[PDB]
């Protein structure tokens with residue numbers, strides 16, 4: 055992968071819309087600065103120069119912030135009509151200024167986020183919540199489009215919500231490949247959960263010197279708001295037909311879950327106040343995504359537990375243990391519901407017992423012959439068995455998904471769950487330098503079952519213990 | 527005590543005015559002081575005109591209303607009360623910035639979401655509310671089952687005493703108060719010695735009944751509580767209900783040595799804080815409870831595996847060292863007794879056979895459709911104070927349809943010093959000086975994943991007996 059290579063956190067440049075000034079913590083002496091710094095601060099505060107009241111009036115407050123626990127800094131510099139925002143970078147203090155947006159009212163913004171927060175807290179459907187948020191951010195940002203983007207496992211992403219003036223195309227329901235947000239980007243966005251690109255064709259403003267005197271290494275601009283972005287992405291943006299962007303990371307249990315991602319046909323900047331409202335929205339949404347994702351997963355483990363109980367009760371109470379699973383109509387229905395499967399095969403040497411919708415004995419024999427040649431210390435699972443075992447495309451209709459599970463130490467006894475092919479049309483807007491066309495690219499997904507939930511596998515892992523234990 | 531209806535006192539505090547409109551927008555009821563604030567005659571019967579947004583709010587879904595009346599320097603805040611519109615005005619707190627408040631709640635929300643210890647979260651919140659309210663003390667108060675409360679966090683100028691760690695009796699916030707505060711999650715008393723401002727008429731024309739002031743911010747409070755406040759040495763208060771999944775979990779409770787009022791804007795920032803904290807309390811309370819069901823599941827698995835594999839089913843529980851250890855860990859118990867008629871099997875730390883026999887004789891007289899449980903068996907069965915040291919907590923459980931077979935879990939007395947700040951054992955009490963006691967005959971409380979693990983195992987046993 056050439057994509058993942060580029061180090062995006064140390065480009066030694068900023069965008070034009072602000073200025074960057076590096077101080078050494080000791081005596082607050084200017085080590086590095088953007089070339090444009092002179093234009094904004096409006097002073098000769100150059101390399102080597104030590105910061106005093108007459109340079110930075112907020113120096114006392116900055117000093118007192120550095121000594122304190124607080125991680126970031128904000129000061130509204132009335133006299134120059136600027137907003138100052140500083141983070142710490144080891145022994146360094148990175149300090150970013152940009153022109154203080156007029157016209158915003160915080161009493162409106164507060165009223166609007168009081169509403170979202172109160173609504174999200176009134177447990178609504180995950181989809182309803184997703185949109186409401188996308189809608190609020192579209193309102194206060196004023197972006198042509200405000201889509202929400204939920205990552206899957208493969209780190210491809212599905213546009214799950216959208217909100218737009220209709221100036222830019224509808225991407226709602228389209229999936230994009232993982233390569234569009236590469237691993238380093240993902241990593242950064244998990245710790246720095248907001249980036250704004252107000253003009254795509256901005257000319258990078260260099261930071262001099264390139265190498266910091268005090269550290270003797272490139273300035274890590276991971277948490278720099280003004281950080282100049284990957285030229286390759288500025289191209290991706292052009293291809294798409296966006297002149298402006300602003301993403302906001304949705305993070306649930308320290309995992310990048312998705313992005314709130316605004317776009318604009320023409321260049322478009324957004325106030326500090328409004329960016330700080332969108333971060334708050336992204337947090338509130340992230341708290342909901344977790345509570346939904348949680349209480350949903352919670353109810354599932356309970357529902358699968360009640361089953362595992364009935365299967366273990368039956369396996370203990372009955373004369374032959376096997377009849378706890380296959381004994382009656384209810385038992386054989388539990389065995390299947392225990393992982394939400396359509397079919398099950400309980401092999402015990404040369405003693406096959408098929409339940410529900412399975413492939414034939416001869417097909418399962420040949421399946422077990424191939425599971426024998428894998429490394430399965432836990433349980434084998436897949437929602438595309440065809441992709442692993444090409445010969446099992448012949449019975450895709452009935453088994454595209456299996457949870458295979460050996461139920462001894464000595465091989466030749468198994469419990470496999472089967473799950474049928476679910477065809478679904480996938481609309482990419484793209485395909486498998488960046489790509490020029492995002493025209494809705496279709497495909498039917500074959501030989502692929504409904505995906506195995508983690509409470510389902512965990513219910514299976516358990517039952518295996520129980521069976522393996524009764525066999526001994 | 528629970529009797530007195532605190533939602534229909536037909537009076538307001540002095541710090542605002544209340545005006546009831548019927549939609550012809552006609553004045554039905556008003557506080558006596560209304561004239562002083564609005565500065566207009568707008569009397570009983572009178573229909574509202576410009577000289578005398580709200581219209582568009584009434585037609586809309588939105589439940590509450592806010593308009594900052596710049597010209598008179600007032601905040602207007604209206605709720606709906608059936609066919610009525612209750613409308614409350616008070617003097618707009620000056621100087622305040624919403625850009626600050628937003629910045630402060632952006633921080634808290636981002637911090638709470640950065641999964642910190644429940645205690646850390648509790649304090650940070652109490653600290654933020656202490657900052658924007660400017661109250662002498664800003665304690666957080668977590669209800670138990672008995673509806674007594676434990677002060678779990680605090681933040682103060684040090685003007686008023688530290689109640690951190692002290693428990694208060696349920697009688698301090700009586701059932702009707704609790705009920706109201708679960709639906710109206712905010713109340714402010716800016717001056718304890720306020721003179722109640724009457725609402726006239728006492729009987730509303732449109733409804734023909736006393737004005738339900740459940741959601742009235744200005745509602746005059748129980749004289750008995752104004753006394754409790756005096757006894758405590760507080761002139762001012764402001765509570766904010768912490769509600770988690772529709773259940774009143776606790777209160778953010780600010781106090782002041784001298785009278786002290788707080789803007790609508792700042793009260794609405796503290797409600798937001800209480801919500802953000804409530805979302806954390808749920809996520810912690812959830813992912814904790816989640817890990818517990820998994821840990822107890824892995825056990826229930828081993829117990830059911832053993833009970834199926836072994837020759838006699840009973841040996842799945844008491845067979846070996848590991849099995850006997852699982853049986854106990856299945857509810858985090860120190861002891862277990864598996865009775866099967868006249869066939870006792872004691873595990874870990876239990877009371878004697880003769881003591882359990884006599885225990886089972888009393889559980890027979892109780893009626894247990896689920897499982898019997900308690901962390902104060904002494905309080906239910908006085909004679910089992912004799913073996914409190916070993917069984918202050920039991921999960922008793924009948925393990926057949928045919929009587930005479932049981933599975934009881936034992937849990938030992940945990941002595942703990944309880945600091946009350948008041949004798950909790952009607953007029954209110956004058957002294958809130960740290961009142962100590964050793965709490966006896968009481969085990970560590972039974973978690974809900976523990977009982978649920980027990981409920982399960984019973985099914986399994988009762989099923990193998992058939």
Ligand SMILES: CCC1=C(C)C2=CC3=N/C(=C\c4[nH]c(/C=C5\NC(=O)C(C)=C5CC)c(C)c4CCC(=O)O)C(CCC(=O)O)=C3CCN2C1=O
Nearest residue numbers: 057062230233234235239249283284286287299301315488
């Ligand atoms: C339709 C849904 C959607 C997608 C798929 C999407 C993509 C997206 N890519 C972004 C970032 C990057 N893409 C790339 C690189 C690539 N993207 C590609 O598609 C390809 C081929 C590359 C080459 C490695 C890089 C390095 C970055 C990090 C830029 C930086 O901060 O320095 C970013 C972050 C840019 C932003 O919005 O500020 C996005 C967000 C915007 N966005 C969307 O709304």
Ligand SMILES: CCC1=C(C)C2=CC3=N/C(=C\c4[nH]c(/C=C5\NC(=O)C(C)=C5CC)c(C)c4CCC(=O)O)C(CCC(=O)O)=C3CCN2C1=O
Nearest residue numbers: 527532694697698699703713747748751754763765779954
């Ligand atoms: C140390 C922790 C703590 C406690 C224990 C506490 C008590 C408290 N009592 C409150 C309310 C009431 N108590 C009572 C009644 C009693 N309080 C008592 O102590 C006693 C004996 C009674 C009657 C039996 C009533 C009716 C009310 C409802 C007042 C209203 O909503 O108008 C209220 C809510 C009233 C408020 O504070 O604004 C509180 C909150 C303040 N507060 C605390 O911070």
